[PDB]
Structures are given as structure tokens and as C-alpha cells.
Amino acid sequence: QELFNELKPAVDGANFIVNHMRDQNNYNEEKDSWNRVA
């Protein structure tokens, strides 16, 4: 359907945003673990 191609930039951008948030959260969690070790 043409709806899929029309919204594909939005779907890909949303997936990229989700991956960015998840990676940032994991990074922050590891830094928090290092803080607790200290």
C-alpha cells in the first residue's frame, strides 16, 4: 500500500529514535553501576 511508503520515513525515524534512547539508557545504567562500585 502507498500508506506504507508514505510513512516509511516516519517509521524508520521512530525506530532510530527508539534505538538511540535505548542505547543511551543502557550507557547511563553502566555508568550508574560504576558509581555504585566506587
Binding site: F4, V11, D12, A14, N15, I17, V18, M21, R22, N25
Partner: peptide, 22 residues
Amino acid sequence: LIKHPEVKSAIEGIKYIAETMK
């Protein structure tokens, strides 16, 4: 429609962001 893995992943991801900032 929602059978596509990507739209499903996008919806679950948006909910993940919302829960994370909550």
C-alpha cells in the same frame, strides 16, 4: 498492517520511552 515487525517495534518503543521518563 501491524503484522509488520517495524510498526510494532515503533509502538512498543514509544511506550518504552514514555515509561523510561516516567
